[PDB]
Design a protein around this ligand. Structure first.
Ligand SMILES: Nc1nc2ncc(CNc3ccc(C(=O)N[C@@H](CCC(=O)N[C@@H](CCC(=O)N[C@@H](CCC(=O)N[C@@H](CCC(=O)O)C(=O)O)C(=O)O)C(=O)O)C(=O)O)cc3)nc2c(=O)[nH]1
Ligand SMILES: Nc1nc2ncc(CNc3ccc(C(=O)N[C@@H](CCC(=O)N[C@@H](CCC(=O)N[C@@H](CCC(=O)N[C@@H](CCC(=O)O)C(=O)O)C(=O)O)C(=O)O)C(=O)O)cc3)nc2c(=O)[nH]1
Ligand SMILES: *[C@@H]1O[C@H](CO)[C@@H](O[C@@H]2O[C@H](CO)[C@@H](O[C@@H]3O[C@H](CO)[C@@H](O)[C@H](O[C@H]4O[C@H](CO)[C@@H](O)[C@H](O)[C@@H]4O)[C@@H]3O)[C@H](O)[C@H]2NC(C)=O)[C@H](O)[C@H]1NC(C)=O
Ligand SMILES: *[C@@H]1O[C@H](CO)[C@@H](O[C@@H]2O[C@H](CO)[C@@H](O[C@@H]3O[C@H](CO)[C@@H](O)[C@H](O[C@H]4O[C@H](CO)[C@@H](O)[C@H](O)[C@@H]4O)[C@@H]3O)[C@H](O)[C@H]2NC(C)=O)[C@H](O)[C@H]1NC(C)=O
Ligand SMILES: *[C@@H]1O[C@H](CO)[C@@H](O[C@@H]2O[C@H](CO)[C@@H](O)[C@H](O)[C@H]2NC(C)=O)[C@H](O)[C@H]1NC(C)=O
Ligand SMILES: *[C@@H]1O[C@H](CO)[C@@H](O[C@@H]2O[C@H](CO)[C@@H](O)[C@H](O)[C@H]2NC(C)=O)[C@H](O)[C@H]1NC(C)=O
Ligand SMILES: *[C@@H]1O[C@H](CO)[C@@H](O[C@@H]2O[C@H](CO)[C@@H](O)[C@H](O)[C@H]2NC(C)=O)[C@H](O)[C@H]1NC(C)=O
Ligand SMILES: *[C@@H]1O[C@H](CO)[C@@H](O[C@@H]2O[C@H](CO)[C@@H](O)[C@H](O)[C@H]2NC(C)=O)[C@H](O)[C@H]1NC(C)=O
Ligand SMILES: *[C@@H]1O[C@H](CO)[C@@H](O[C@@H]2O[C@H](CO)[C@@H](O)[C@H](O)[C@H]2NC(C)=O)[C@H](O)[C@H]1NC(C)=O
Ligand SMILES: *[C@@H]1O[C@H](CO)[C@@H](O[C@@H]2O[C@H](CO)[C@@H](O)[C@H](O)[C@H]2NC(C)=O)[C@H](O)[C@H]1NC(C)=O
Ligand SMILES: *[C@@H]1O[C@H](CO)[C@@H](O)[C@H](O)[C@H]1NC(C)=O
Ligand SMILES: *[C@@H]1O[C@H](CO)[C@@H](O)[C@H](O)[C@H]1NC(C)=O
Ligand SMILES: *[C@@H]1O[C@H](CO)[C@@H](O)[C@H](O)[C@H]1NC(C)=O
Ligand SMILES: *[C@@H]1O[C@H](CO)[C@@H](O)[C@H](O)[C@H]1NC(C)=O
Ligand SMILES: *[C@@H]1O[C@H](CO)[C@@H](O)[C@H](O)[C@H]1NC(C)=O
Ligand SMILES: *[C@@H]1O[C@H](CO)[C@@H](O)[C@H](O)[C@H]1NC(C)=O
Ligand SMILES: [Ca+2]
Ligand SMILES: [Ca+2]
Ligand SMILES: [Cl-]
Ligand SMILES: [Cl-]
Ligand SMILES: [Zn+2]
Ligand SMILES: [Zn+2]
Ligand SMILES: [Zn+2]
Ligand SMILES: [Zn+2]
Lengths: 693, 693
């Protein structure tokens, strides 16, 4: 009973069977079908051998279209005649044209409204796109309906940016430039997005809060809820997503200013004029949105499985991923959930033979992730005291594949060495690398930008269920999946993301017919969980944090040094931060020496507690400015793109666009405050690794 | 080497020698004399045998009178002639009339100003005193100078209340009613306050923040400081304290309204007229303050001594008390510091013989406590990560005596059983109880209001250095001292508190000639530290928390039930809170069973960690409303009196004066929110005691 036994028990054929099982009907959060799936998973995890398997339910704010009053967009003429209407649904895929309860495309949490106005095209609706419009082009979005292409940044940030520009509505669409790979056919004949395809998704700006009505506390049966007016993160203007056939009809008549440059042009045969409004002949026509979606407090269900530890049952290694989907969830999330299911089955086989892990393993099937990470966040709010004193690590398990090219890992620096070591022991599933390690193929295909002979491992961003564990609670977190070639594939994510076309057949036909990439991902995620839960000494290398901290300090200093005169005027010094990083490096090196130089279980556990609480030490209980649930001082989701991680986010945000601030003394004062907070936090974290007395 | 050996080594004669040594010259925070004392203590603790003894320094905002521009108050006539002036200093006591550097009486952190106006007498300047003035008597304090007697509540609350009433200045004085015990002589012939005596003290409203300029972070060498305008807790109006000879001259001419009842009358031969202003003949006279004190960032020094644990060096039991004094510190704090010194000496004697405690003991000599608990708070801010993951308990050690009648203990319910057990093993020092236990004498003299044959133990309030440990960080805390008879002694604290007369001779002549009460207090504080640091199982009884939680739930429900119609209208239910308390009771009982039913050091330490993190579980990382550093959900300092503890403070404050709120729906909504937070926190704390997996 060792890791090899665990790994060998995992089967591609089982992952395939589970994926098929999980994807025959929609499992939208808050629906009966997703409750039934929760009950099925609960029953199977018990069967598989877990010690306890419970449902944890919460009543959270969700959002749904009105079944009898459909959402749509029109072009309306000067007489009020609606001369063009966007689609009411995606053409369902072959053999699913009679499937009931497919939610039509909508932007979850949009308010209701019927705004009419002139269109402005805002490219990706990024912060810099809006800078270009108002500052350079002198185009005013106030009272306009903005149309933005999906891609580059989280859609909630696009909506926030549009609101702040004064838009009265937002239309999101999928441009073939970003969602149609050259030389591949549209679904069902290939993996591209057809012109009738539409990306669903929520447009909240929760900043880690969880359920909009209950920030800080679980949405249990006696919860006090905020009124809707005080809810966290809701958009103030109506929003709706469309496909590129419909977008073409909205964009083709656009007049006003030409696009500023080629980076504003997608692939449709339209000029990509910014507007506002339509060309001469059509200048009296307008665009009208009709949004009738409703926000509803609705019950959601997490499945929580426990495999009790033999030696340290009060130490938790968590493997979690969500279960709710927009429609069939062929990739997102069921390609992940099928992998978790097989991992539970394998651990359970060992358990039935008399094995237990050293530490407790918790397995989670989260609900309502698509509506803002609600299930994971409410559960973590409920259990925060247990998690912060006992939480060793969190391994996420959403989509197992977004491509078939190579591995992708995003994690805390504390897991780098674990990931390198594990992948050296796993077989590469790649063509041309038969008999080679996954480390070799991954390193060849995705080289580290810093180091020769190492693979790229990214920072954690957000937009997935590790957010509460990592950025709020400070528990070492990681994720892994198979991905595309980022050098040659310039499209955004995978094309059929959050569409009706994301099916079992998509995966089986186009992504992973042999389920070998799924199996490799199960071995990576499961192997990480195995080592974290069973290694005598926790498999964290504090020295890897020291290396990245210096890289991040260099980076933030370099941003600041774009303003040398202001740094002179306001005496802005990074000396404290570099000092703290130098001290962290020294103390980490000495800790590492002791870790290998110590039969004493108290010194061991004392050392294991130092390892465990190291990630915890980067937490500031006061949070980041105006984002109280982003508490990690080294990493937060980018304020411009929830998906991306930002390093030293407090200093980064203080420096961002600083040359535009009206009061430079105040602005640079805040930069100096953030440097102090960061230097202090790095030093305090270092000191947790010093000898304890 | 057991507790008896430790206890037997403590000597009254040593405590006496140390007290004499610590009280010959003033040790005002931020002065050279207090730095020299820090260095002396550091050297002696090393001598005594501690493993390491370091100074931890910070640069914090302090406040001092201007040496060449003295503070004083006048009565001024209509021509601007100052016809009466308050004293510039207290007459120094016999043999100290040539002692240099006695700080004259002042209110630390007063702004500068020379406000002139009509006096209003506001009794104790409590919330209810101001209610009586504005609501019942219809007396407007706006633009008036308020005169308030010291007593009943922390003077910072009096100042806050006066500011909010619109006062332009505050005069604080010591009324003989509150500071002159019948039948006892004034110092030097007895322990009463003479008419020239004055109580120093700060008038901040920090709400746990520490240094006003650096809330959340240690005031280290690279700290970013707030500007004075944004500092935490500073008063907006000038404030000055005076003795009763001077108060008599200010009060005797008072006209306007009669005092509302006898509870507004002190003991001076004046009418205690409320005002505003003086009677007919003197109506054109006014009162003028002259305050020239300055706030100054100043270095302060904590001494931190470590006695490394033999088995659990990463578990900290802390014995701390302050060293800085207003003048000589004969009682406050040196009667406490002398006791800590002897405790360190005793532990060191055992250490030199080869003994070590099981857990690490930290000893602290805090600086700047008199200026707002600054030294303890800055150090805890610096070390917060170590303290919250490793902090077992904090035992405070300010003044050892405030009387000679019986023991006083204020502590977490987690220490009740420890305190009962220890005091049963200690000898009573009381006359008439020779050969009896301290438990017996204490129980006879200060019976529990709830339980026959038990002694009174109070809630922790604040105004002392346990505040950051207990209310911010959630570390089990306690304190003990000898006190007066609360039934027969209706004066406030001890009369010479914070005056020049608080000397070695005061203690040796009047309070404790044999140093037997000091010795008993050393045995209580030291014994608690010994048991906390050496007991195999932590000496905490979670069931005692269950009992008090029910008492507090009953109490807060009873306050709410004063408004039955509103509870019906707004559906205000305490069911969730009582449910949580019932669950806590059940889970605690089961935990206690397991604690006694389990050779396994992991189960032991797992159980010890459950005991240690139980106090920690009452912490809400979001803090209480507008008081982010008061995080404990069960206990906070009263919003009306920092000295007093309040239970379920979030609900208490939501209910306080609720019938006066303009929007009852909003006000009762907030009551229901606080019930939810409290019920959730109690349940979450209970769940930390459940089986871990
Ligand atoms: N030069 C170079 N760079 C590379 N960078 C990376 C890689 C390997 N894989 C990647 C790793 C990181 C990135 C990356 O950093 N991209 C961006 C943004 C950060 C990022 O991770 N972006 C993702 C964004 C997509 C994402 O994370 N999506 C989520 C969506 C889950 C979801 O549906 N969540 C819901 C709810 C979200 C919520 O409510 O919070 C929703 O979004 O609707 C997910 O898949 O987990 C991406 O485009 O690859 C950047 O430039 O900084 C890109 C590719 N390879 C290379 C390379 O070969 N060369
Ligand atoms: N019926 C009945 N009740 C009793 N209650 C108690 C006791 C035994 N001892 C007591 C325990 C609690 C109380 C008590 O709860 N009193 C008040 C207020 C709470 C309290 O503890 N009050 C203290 C206030 C004094 C105090 O704590 N002072 C601080 C001052 C330290 C200091 O100088 N700090 C600085 C800095 C403070 C800062 O900046 O925060 C300063 O204040 O300037 C201290 O001595 O530690 C008191 O009057 O006894 C109440 O009714 O709720 C009173 C006496 N015995 C009895 C009894 O026999 N019968
Ligand atoms: C990284 O680790 C190092 C330890 O190896 C740590 O060094 C510390 O730096 C501080 C701040 O620079 C030092 O503080 C000095 O402490 C002495 C007392 O020991 C004081 O006398 C000094 O004050 C004087 O000088 C100041 C600067 O010119 C004046 O502003 C001030 O008014 C005084 O005149 C000063 O406070 C401290 O001694 C060392 N500790 C050591 C060497 O052990 C460093 O702080 C760590 N980095 C971080 C970011 O924490
Ligand atoms: C104290 O401990 C007890 C456990 O001994 C714990 O009891 C729990 O109470 C909650 C809330 O009352 C129970 O929740 C119910 O859970 C079931 C599923 O098991 C749901 O079907 C219930 O919902 C329905 O009924 C509600 C009330 O009428 C409706 O509002 C709702 O719309 C549904 O129709 C309800 O959520 C939970 O089952 C028990 N758990 C047990 C018995 O193990 C109690 O909560 C603890 N106290 C505190 C303050 O935490
Ligand atoms: C997915 O697999 C589950 C588990 O096999 C199927 O649920 C079982 O269905 C059979 C036959 O209907 C029942 O007798 C069992 O009680 C079910 N077991 C459960 C729920 O744990 C389920 O039908 C499959 N779903 C699909 C779409 O194929
Ligand atoms: C777009 O949809 C709208 C809404 O269904 C259509 O307009 C309606 O047409 C019917 C029948 O002609 C009228 O009775 C309604 O009054 C209309 N409603 C509104 C809101 O205008 C419209 O015909 C559609 N346009 C196209 C081109 O299909
Ligand atoms: C990853 O693998 C390396 C190589 O085995 C591990 O580093 C070795 O660890 C052992 C045990 O402490 C030492 O004796 C060796 O000196 C180390 N070799 C090195 C650093 O080159 C490393 O600890 C593993 N990482 C984990 C488990 O997180
Ligand atoms: C308080 O006691 C200390 C410790 O004995 C005295 O400090 C010592 O004084 C002698 C004689 O001046 C020196 O030789 C030592 O170096 C001192 N030891 C220290 C500082 O650790 C101090 O003088 C006493 N203070 C008073 C007021 O009596
Ligand atoms: C109260 O103190 C003030 C301040 O010292 C005294 O008034 C001063 O008196 C001197 C000499 O008579 C004058 O030159 C100053 O101009 C006065 N200063 C002010 C501010 O008035 C005053 O005499 C004292 N009153 C009593 C009764 O002692
Ligand atoms: C205080 O003393 C009592 C009496 O000895 C302790 O309670 C006993 O503890 C032992 C050991 O667990 C049990 O065998 C007895 O049944 C207990 N007797 C009781 C509760 O009456 C108590 O644990 C001590 N409190 C501490 C150490 O905090
Ligand atoms: C949906 O729309 C229908 C009619 O178009 C309306 O009667 C109903 O109130 C709506 N449902 C909601 C708001 O849940
Ligand atoms: C944009 O539009 C409206 C006019 O309708 C105006 O109120 C607003 O101030 C304008 N903003 C800018 C930056 O021109
Ligand atoms: C799978 O890999 C092949 C070969 O590189 C490639 O042509 C194809 O596009 C990949 N499929 C997907 C869905 O990425
Ligand atoms: C104190 O007062 C004197 C003169 O009365 C003045 O010169 C000096 O500035 C003051 N000291 C301060 C404000 O520290
Ligand atoms: C009290 O006094 C001033 C008049 O100088 C006035 O502005 C204020 O509103 C008054 N307040 C009340 C409650 O009468
Ligand atoms: C000490 O105790 C005696 C006897 O009860 C009492 O008369 C005296 O007032 C006490 N001294 C002090 C300072 O409380
Ligand atoms: Ca919540
Ligand atoms: Ca501070
Ligand atoms: Cl993932
Ligand atoms: Cl005390
Ligand atoms: Zn997903
Ligand atoms: Zn998704
Ligand atoms: Zn004190
Ligand atoms: Zn004091």
């Amino acid at each position: 009973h060792n890791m090899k036994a665990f790994l060998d028990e995992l089967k591609a054929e089982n992952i395939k069977k589970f994926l098929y099982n999980f994807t025959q009907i929609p499992h939208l959060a808050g629906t009966e079908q997703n409750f039934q799936l929760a009950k099925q998973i609960q029953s199977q995890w018990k069967e598989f051998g877990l010690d306890s398997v419970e449902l944890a339910h919460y009543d959270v704010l969700l959002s749904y279209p009105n079944k009898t009053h459909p959402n749509y967009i029109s072009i309306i003429n000067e007489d009020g005649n609606e001369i063009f209407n966007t689609s009411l649904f995606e053409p369902p895929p072959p053999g699913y044209e009679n499937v009931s309860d497919i939610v039509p495309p909508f932007s979850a949490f949009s308010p209701q409204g019927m705004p009419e106005g002139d269109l402005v095209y805002v490219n990706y609706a990024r912060t810099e796109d809006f800078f270009k419009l108002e500052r350079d082009m002198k185009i005013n979005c106030s009272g306009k309906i903005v149309i933005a292409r999906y891609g580059k940044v989280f859609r909630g940030n696009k909506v926030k940016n549009a609101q702040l520009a004064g838009a009265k509505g937002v239309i999101l669409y999928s441009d073939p430039a970003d969602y149609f790979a050259p030389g591949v056919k549209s679904y069902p004949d290939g993996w591209n997005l057809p012109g009738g395809g539409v990306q669903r998704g929520n447009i909240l700006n929760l900043n880690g809060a969880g359920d909009p009505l209950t920030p800080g506390y679980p949405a249990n049966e006696y919860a006090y809820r905020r009124g809707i007016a005080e809810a966290v993160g809701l958009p103030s203007i109506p929003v709706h997503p469309i496909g590129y056939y419909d977008a073409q009809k909205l964009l083709e008549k656009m007049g006003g200013s030409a696009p500023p440059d080629s980076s504003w042009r997608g692939s449709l045969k339209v000029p990509y004029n910014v507007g506002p409004g339509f060309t001469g002949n059509f200048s009296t026509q307008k665009v009208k949105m009709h949004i009738h979606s409703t926000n509803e407090v609705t019950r959601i269900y997490n499945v929580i499985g426990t495999l009790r530890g033999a030696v340290e049952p009060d130490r938790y290694v968590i493997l979690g991923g969500h279960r709710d989907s927009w429609v069939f969830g062929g990739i997102d999330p069921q390609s992940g959930a099928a992998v978790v299911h097989e991992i539970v089955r394998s651990f359970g086989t060992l358990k039935k033979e008399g094995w237990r892990p050293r530490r407790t393993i918790l397995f989670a099937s989260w609900d309502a992730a698509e509506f803002g990470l609600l299930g994971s966040t409410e559960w973590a709010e409920e259990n925060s005291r247990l998690l912060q004193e006992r939480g060793v690590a969190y391994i996420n398990a959403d989509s197992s594949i977004e491509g078939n090219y190579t591995l992708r890992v995003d994690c805390t620096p504390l897991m780098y060495s674990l990931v390198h070591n594990l992948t050296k022991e796993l077989k590469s599933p790649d063509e041309g690398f038969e008999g080679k390690s996954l480390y070799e193929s991954w390193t060849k295909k995705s080289p580290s930008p810093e180091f020769s002979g190492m693979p790229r491992i990214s920072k954690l961003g957000s937009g997935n269920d590790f957010e509460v564990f990592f950025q709020r609670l400070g528990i070492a977190s990681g994720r892994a999946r198979y991905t595309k070639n980022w050098e040659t594939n310039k499209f955004s994510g995978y094309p059929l993301y959050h569409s009706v076309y994301e099916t079992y057949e998509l995966v089986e036909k186009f992504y992973d017919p042999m389920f070998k990439y799924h199996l490799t991902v199960a071995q990576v995620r499961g192997g990480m969980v195995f080592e974290l839960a069973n290694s005598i000494v926790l498999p964290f290398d504090c020295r890897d944090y020291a290396v990245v901290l210096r890289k991040y300090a260099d980076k933030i200093y370099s941003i600041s040094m774009k303003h040398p005169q202001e740094m002179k005027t306001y005496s802005v010094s990074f000396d404290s931060l570099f000092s703290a990083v130098k001290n962290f490096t020294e103390i980490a090196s000495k800790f590492s020496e002791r870790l290998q130089d110590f039969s004493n279980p108290i010194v061991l556990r004392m050392m294991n507690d130092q390892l465990m609480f190291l990630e915890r030490a980067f937490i500031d209980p006061l949070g980041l400015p105006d984002r109280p649930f982003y508490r990690h001082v080294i990493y937060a989701p980018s304020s411009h793109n929830k998906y991306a991680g930002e390093s030293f986010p407090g200093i980064y945000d203080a420096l961002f666009d600083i040359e535009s601030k009206v009061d430079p003394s105040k602005a640079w004062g805040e930069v100096k405050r953030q440097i102090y907070v960061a230097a202090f936090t790095v030093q305090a974290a270092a000191e947790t690794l010093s000898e304890v007395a």
